[PDB]
From a paper:
The kallikrein-related proteases are a family of secreted serine proteases, a number of which have been implicated in viral replication. [name], associated with neurological diseases like MS, Alzheimer's,5 and Parkinson's,6 and with the migration and invasion, and thereby metastasis, of tumor cells, has also recently been linked to the zoster (chickenpox) virus. Infected keratinocytes were found to overexpress [name] and MDM2, and their overexpression was directly linked to viral propagation. We recently reported the synthesis and biological characterization of highly potent benzamidine [name] inhibitors DKFZ-917 (1) and DKFZ-918 (2), with pIC50 values of 8.6 and 8.3, respectively, and good selectivity over related serine proteases.12 In order to perform more advanced preclinical experiments with these substances, and to be able to make them freely available to other researchers, we required larger quantities than were originally prepared in the hit-to-lead optimization process.
We were pleased to find that DKFZ-917 and DKFZ-918 behaved as expected in a [name] enzymatic inhibition assay with pIC50 values of 8.51 (8.49–8.52 95% confidence interval) and 8.22 (8.18–8.25 95% confidence interval), respectively (see ESI†). The oxazolidinone carbonyl makes indirect contact to Q192 via water #143, which makes hydrogen bonds to both moieties. The amide bond sits directly over active site S195, and the carbonyl forms a hydrogen bond with G193 in the oxyanion hole as well as water #1. The amide NH is engaged in a hydrogen bond to water #36. The ethyl group nicely fills the S1′ pocket and the naphthyl group extends into the S2′ pocket.
Residue numbers in the entry: 16 to 36, 38 to 67, 69 to 125, 127 to 130, 132 to 147, 150 to 205, 210 to 222, 222A, ...
Amino acid sequence: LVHGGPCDKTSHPYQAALYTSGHLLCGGVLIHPLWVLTAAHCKKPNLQVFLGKHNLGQQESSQEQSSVVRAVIHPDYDAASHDQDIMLLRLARPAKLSELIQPLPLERDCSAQTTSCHILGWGKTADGDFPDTIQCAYIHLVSREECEHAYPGQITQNMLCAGDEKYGKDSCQGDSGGPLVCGDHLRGLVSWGNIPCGSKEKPGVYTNVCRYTNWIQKTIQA
Ligand SMILES: CC[C@H](NC(=O)[C@H]1CN(c2ccc(C(=N)N)cc2)C(=O)O1)c1cccc2ccccc12
């Protein structure tokens, strides 16, 4: 993510890091002791999930590593447009919850009022580097009308736009599937946006999690 800074160490207990081949692939969000949400475009074989991490270069006493034993991409995901860019990952065992490992409640209300949000991740920064320490930035949800204006004809009801007019804080490569948190609820997932990253003119685009309540429930209860 670009134009942010290191997160407070205790402020992100729901953040997951998704690895394959020993390297960071995506972010993710713990939503249940057995389940992490990420972007559909993150699907690959041999996925490992790290919970409780802050610095990727350290073996942290709070961390837990787990294999993904089932990956359930949304059946209607459209790779070209990123429509329905959501996937549920079932962990090999219930997450060992702690002060630093906690699920984040979902925003189920698609009419929810709160537009002050934040994003987090270990993706690319404004200098091009990939940080060991998780980065955070405050950004704002934009109205559906302003979102449609930024990407004419390319915004569906399954997408939200958010960004920052002052500094252009924005998510980036490596942050996919990370949470857009608004009013301390999960509102969206990092999906797509401008390259180079930066939201001063075109906002980042996020999967609208409130549209997936029923699919999430059916998947978890199957
Ligand atoms: C799963 C592969 C991974 N895909 C992505 O990160 C996606 C997400 N995204 C992207 C671009 C701009 C914004 C924005 N809000 N402005 C948000 C997301 C993008 O372009 O692709 C990836 C792509 C390229 C380099 C990487 C390096 C390390 C780890 C993952 C990398």
